[PDB]
């Protein structure tokens, strides 16, 4: 499967483990027990 992306997305992101969405996600990074779970995956105002 192919995912479109700019031609300038630097390579050092692909020289290790990574995510095709280009942004980490998931329950593992919750930090707190009440943190917004779908604000890690989508909310693009907070840094990755």
């Amino acid at each position: 499967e192919f995912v479109a992306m700019p031609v300038s997305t630097d390579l050092q992101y692909f020289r290790t483990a990574c995510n095709p969405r280009g942004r980490a996600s998931g329950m593992l990074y919750m930090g707190d027990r009440d943190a917004d779970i779908e604000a890690i995956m989508f909310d693009h105002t907070q840094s990755d």
Partner: protein, 48 residues
Amino acid sequence: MLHDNVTESLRRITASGGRLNPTEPLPIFGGLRPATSAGIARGQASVC
């Protein structure tokens, strides 16, 4: 600074290039603080 517009300009520009900034309207009980991120990945962010 002498003018109160250059100060807001500087404080917005410096916030455009980092994530530690105090992005809140001045709270009365705490002094100043950064916003709580939704997640955390690699440990405690060491301030340079």
